[PDB]
Design a protein around this ligand. Structure first.
Ligand code: K
Ligand code: MG
Ligand code: MG
Ligand code: MG
Ligand code: MG
Ligand code: MG
Ligand code: MG
Ligand code: MG
Ligand code: MG
Ligand code: MG
Ligand code: MG
Ligand code: MG
Ligand code: MG
Ligand code: MG
Ligand code: MG
Ligand code: MG
Ligand code: MG
Ligand code: MG
Ligand code: MG
Ligand code: MG
Ligand code: MG
Ligand code: MG
Lengths: 185, 155, 51, 222, 148, 53
RNA sequence: GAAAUUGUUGAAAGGGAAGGGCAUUUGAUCAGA
RNA sequence: GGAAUACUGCCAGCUGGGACUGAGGACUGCGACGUAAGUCAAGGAUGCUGGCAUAAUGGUUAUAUGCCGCCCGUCUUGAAACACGGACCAAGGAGUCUAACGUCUAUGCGAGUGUUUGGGUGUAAAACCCAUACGCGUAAUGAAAGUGAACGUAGGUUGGGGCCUCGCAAGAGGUGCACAAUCGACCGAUCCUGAUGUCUUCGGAUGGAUUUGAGUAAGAGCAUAGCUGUUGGGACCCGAAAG
RNA sequence: AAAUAUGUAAGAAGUCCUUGUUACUUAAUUGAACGUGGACAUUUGAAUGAAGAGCUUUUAGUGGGCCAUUUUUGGUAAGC
């Protein structure tokens, strides 16, 4: 017998391959597994880990987010890497010329980048251009902007978006939500 | 299709054995086995017979002789672990045993073997006859009697 | 592939600890100590034998 | 271009230089041990001759072996055993003696047999059952290159350097001891010498401080 | 599908994953929202504050078409213009021939002022506008025309 | 201790190279020689039982 | 044309149940080389 | 006074007998001996020999022998129970489908998404194509009238992966997405303050607050599918006394 | 007035030096808080350990307990 100080046979708790059966995603995973194993560049390892992420862990990165990241001092000529979908954003009226590497581009996002004079490239094209992630800028979309997230941690005095089907007057607003009916929260 | 044959088959290329570090060093036989010592055969068709130890062979066997004239045990190989080395010794200076070896014993009786048996036996009788009762001792078969304790007995 | 124990397997014992050869050659495990003749004090002896 | 001979010859030369360093270090360690032992013996003799008593320095090192199973252990002694890495019966570790560790030994006394290990005991333990914790793995200390690659930054180049750092509680004793995987000893080969293990050694049992007899126990357990 | 459910995996296990001590009974705590004030009060106060009681005044025969008023922020203000003409109107930012944006025809009732627009005149036709939306439209050299 | 450690570190980097700014637990006592001069050992024995009540 | 259950034949065992586990003896039978 | 011996301990002292194991499968390594060739007990067994070549080993089976072995299922703190169901066998036999949903995951598109109410079409319940709407999302807040999200490079501070520069390296500096804490700003509600103006009772600029909102602060959702979980349904299957 | 048990601390989110903001506070640049700048890495300030740490979501079963040492209540006591 052994007095175990930790749980035995505990899985790492992190994905080691995508849950997806996309053959092209599996090929990209293979390429970046090779790169992460035989380059020692942290960019390749983080891209390989990002390729495993689920959909809610790969929020879309808008072109406006890419432009704001490129407005960083010294990042104007860096290749923007988004392991996920790049979406369009009509709220920004001036997009700069740049190279964006992403898993997927929305038609509008690709059109905006091309019209601004840049290129939309795949992750294997990015690997060929910069095998060690030279001059790269990894961008991640807002994870906690999800609709599901605001209901997380619901409870007294949390302010955490009760799970409700219809909203308005008569829908969970009287007893426990205001001092005039019993108490507020 | 009855089994939907597997995608991959094991290769039928037998890999070579890696180099073994086991040299065949000469056997270190116990100090009681000295040529001329009288041994008791513990197994075989001549089990219990007392024979005379002779040249140590290259296959780790002991060349022994009855002598054949004394008890009917010819020149033959014997395993060192299947004999008891007694404390009775005849001199083997004068017995020429360089001829006998593994190839000599490699597999009605050959006249050559009869002749070498006679040649060795002549010297063996000559040496034995200067010790009283030694011929009778070698003619008599060893056996355990009631009360014999081999862990206490001396040979 | 197989752990070979020192304190046996003189080959492994010499692979580790190259000083083992000098130790064995000089018999440092059975070194004679220089003789001395200091005697315990009378007070020590009296205290030891005191009832 | 060959890039084979001019590399294997350089590796053999570096190995020979490392072995020369290890040889001189081991000779110095042997001289140090001999000098310290004869100095203690002579100090005792001189104090007796002068009519004084030489009080030996308190032991700086203990070897602790867990002699109790893993069932029915109270939480505080169980935690102390885990922090001393005795998570299995007949597992043993070296502990540098301070007040902080003496109180731990006091807490876990009914479940361990501990004492002061000799040079022979430490050498045999490290030689036969010496394993290093390398990348969270238990790797046997079958070559000095392993010890150099894992403890070289502390000046420990060989298994005898490790043994010296253990016996003489050095600046890097903590790192060397933690590098040493907890020794997995067998049951004693001649038995425990007592009918019942789980009373104190002073009371005819097996647990508690058995100061110098830990060497005989560990040797029979090794 | 059924072959992937845990009930195939519970075959041969007597309690079907529902426990030996507490079984799968019919309605141990009542049906539906029973006891929301008595024995489910904790789960009603937590995760559903405000559920019980009344909170405002009634409105008999309320028609949502009266309150139909989709809001469009200033931050887009330009997707209502066709994509091709957008570049042609962003260039030549003249007070004359300013692009006309019928927000009601686009399907909005109120224009709000969340984002910021480029400094180019636009003629915005809206049923309602926010004060800051009108301020930003005017600061961009445009104007707001009230329609119905 | 913080102020004393700062002062000790400054005086160390002014005088030589030695700091030892970490506290240490009580260490085992070193060897010492105990004399009997005026201190000859007195032999004690366990006392017999009595009540004295 | 199953099983429960039954007859006959054949084999085997059987001092107040039978059945089973590890191991081997014995009898019968049999694969692989 | 000189030893010896006991006891305890040490030796990288020598050596005999016994048992179990032989994993790995070209070389690579660390060593030892040898001047060097090379050899080796040095990153796991080889060498020689004999008998058999089949029921001999072995498997299966019946029996015998040694030791062990209470009847399953269930409720239970506790079952072999003098607790309940079960004489036996065959067949049937119990978490299903649906409406609406939570989380997670996969897929398509993405500030949009959903062709399938319907229309066109068809090799005719299929497949293929489609307009206007509609639903959900892109704005919230207030009981409501109503109002409605940039002072700022969409902020400051701290940590932050990655990236950039220098450095052999250690490290130093710069930029820092997501995310975490905090201080701010903005939108709605509440409480205040109350400018020009004026249908003199309207209007509500500006500046605030230990108040409050399921908000803004370069959008993430929509649709399909799956496990799991929820509610209503006969609702895992069988069961009342009753009405 | 113990023993056992128990709160806190053992540093870079630290210490030290100079001086910027405020509608707070002071008689007063007085103090308070938050700061700019500058200095200090071998032991960055006890020991031991660390199949790492931190974080989130969603769900099952459970919500009859019982026994042993020790402390202990009612009871003569109890397999209470
Ligand atoms: K239940
Ligand atoms: Mg185990
Ligand atoms: Mg192994
Ligand atoms: Mg024994
Ligand atoms: Mg015992
Ligand atoms: Mg189960
Ligand atoms: Mg049940
Ligand atoms: Mg028929
Ligand atoms: Mg039948
Ligand atoms: Mg009878
Ligand atoms: Mg002895
Ligand atoms: Mg057999
Ligand atoms: Mg029994
Ligand atoms: Mg009961
Ligand atoms: Mg039962
Ligand atoms: Mg009973
Ligand atoms: Mg019942
Ligand atoms: Mg019955
Ligand atoms: Mg059936
Ligand atoms: Mg019924
Ligand atoms: Mg009724
Ligand atoms: Mg219950």
């Amino acid at each position: 017998g052994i007095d175990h100080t930790s749980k035995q046979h505990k899985r790492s708790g992190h994905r080691t391959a995508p849950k997806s059966d996309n053959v092209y995603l599996k090929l990209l995973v293979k390429l970046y597994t090779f790169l992460a194993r035989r380059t020692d560049a942290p960019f390749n390892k983080v891209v390989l880990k990002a390729l495993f992420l689920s959909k809610i862990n790969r929020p879309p990165v808008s072109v406006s987010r890419i432009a704001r990241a490129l407005k960083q001092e010294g990042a104007a000529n860096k290749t923007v890497v988004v392991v996920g979908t790049v979406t369009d954003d009509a709220r920004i009226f001036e997009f700069p010329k740049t190279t964006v590497a992403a898993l997927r581009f929305t038609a509008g996002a690709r059109a905006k980048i091309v019209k601004a004079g840049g290129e939309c490239i795949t992750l294997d094209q990015l690997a060929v251009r910069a095998p060690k992630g030279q001059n790269t800028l990894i961008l991640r979309g807002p994870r906690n902007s999800r609709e599901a997230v605001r209901h997380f941690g619901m409870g007294p005095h949390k302010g955490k978006a009760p799970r409700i089907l219809s909203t308005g007057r008569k829908f969970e607003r009287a007893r426990g939500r205001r001092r005039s009916k019993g108490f507020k929260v | 299709s009855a089994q939907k044959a597997p995608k991959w088959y094991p290769s039928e290329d037998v890999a070579a054995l890696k180099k073994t570090r086991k040299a065949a060093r000469p056997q270190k036989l116990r100090a009681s086995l000295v040529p001329g010592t009288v041994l008791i055969l513990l197994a075989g068709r001549f089990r219990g017979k007392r024979v005379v130890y002779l040249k140590h062979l290259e296959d780790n066997t002991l060349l022994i002789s009855g002598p054949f004239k004394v008890n009917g045990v010819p020149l033959r190989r014997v395993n060192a672990r299947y004999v008891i080395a007694t404390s009775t010794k005849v001199s083997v200076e004068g017995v020429n045993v360089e001829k006998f070896n593994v190839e000599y014993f490699a597999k009605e009786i050959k006249a050559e073997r009869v002749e070498d048996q006679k040649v060795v036996d002549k010297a063996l009788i000559a040496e034995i006859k200067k010790t009283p009762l030694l011929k009778q001792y070698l003619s008599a078969s060893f056996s355990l009697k009631n009360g014999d304790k081999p862990h206490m007995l001396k040979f | 592939v197989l752990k070979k124990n020192p304190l046996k397997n003189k080959q492994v014992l010499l692979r580790l600890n190259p000083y083992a050869k000098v130790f064995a050659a000089e018999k440092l495990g059975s070194k004679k100590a220089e003789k001395t003749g200091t005697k315990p004090a009378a007070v020590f002896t009296e205290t030891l034998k005191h009832d | 271009a060959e890039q084979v001979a001019a590399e294997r010859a350089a590796r053999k030369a570096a190995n020979k230089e490392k072995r020369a360093i290890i040889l001189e270090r081991n000779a110095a360690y042997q001289k140090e041990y001999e000098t310290a032992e004869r100095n203690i013996i002579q100090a005792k003799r001189d104090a007796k001759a002068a009519g004084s008593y030489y009080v030996e320095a308190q032991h700086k090192l203990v070897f602790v072996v867990r002699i109790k199973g893993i069932n029915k252990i109270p939480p505080k002694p169980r935690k102390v055993l885990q922090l001393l890495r005795l998570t299995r019966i007949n597992s043993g570790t070296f502990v540098k003696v301070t007040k902080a560790t003496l109180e731990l030994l006091k807490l876990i006394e009914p479940y361990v047999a501990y004492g002061y290990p000799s040079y022979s005991t430490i050498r045999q333990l490290v030689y036969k059952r010496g394993f290093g914790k390398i990348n969270k793995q238990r790797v046997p200390l079958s070559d000095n290159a392993i010890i150099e690659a894992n403890l070289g930054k502390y000046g420990i180049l060989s298994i005898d350097d490790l043994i010296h750092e253990i016996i003489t509680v050095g600046p890097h004793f903590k790192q060397a001891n933690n590098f040493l995987w907890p020794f997995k000893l067998s049951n004693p080969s001649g038995g425990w010498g007592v009918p019942r293990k789980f009373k104190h050694f002073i009371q005819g049992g097996s647990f508690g401080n058995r100061e110098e007899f830990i060497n005989k126990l560990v040797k029979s357990m090794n | 599908p059924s072959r992937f459910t845990k009930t195939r995996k519970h075959r041969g296990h007597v309690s079907a994953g529902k426990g030996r001590i507490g079984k799968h009974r019919k309605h141990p705590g009542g049906r539906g929202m029973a006891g929301g004030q008595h024995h489910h009060r904790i789960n009603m106060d937590k995760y559903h504050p405000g559920y019980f009681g009344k909170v405002g005044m009634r409105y008999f025969h309320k028609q949502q078409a009266h309150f139909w008023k989709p809001v469009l922020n200033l931050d887009k203000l330009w997707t209502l213009i066709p994509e091709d003409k957008r570049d042609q109107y962003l260039k030549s930012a003249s007070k004359e021939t300013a692009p006309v944006i019928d927000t009601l025809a686009a399907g909005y009732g109120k224009i709000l002022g969340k984002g910021r627009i480029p400094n180019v005149p636009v003629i915005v036709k809206a049923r309602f506008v926010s004060k800051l939306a009108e301020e930003k439209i005017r600061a961009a050299g445009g104007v707001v025309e009230l329609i119905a | 201790r913080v102020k004393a450690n700062a002062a000790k570190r400054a005086e160390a980097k002014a005088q030589g190279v030695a700091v030892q700014l970490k506290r240490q637990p009580a260490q085992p006592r070193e060897s010492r020689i105990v004399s009997t001069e005026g201190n000859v050992p007195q032999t004690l024995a366990p006392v017999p039982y009595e009540t004295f009540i």
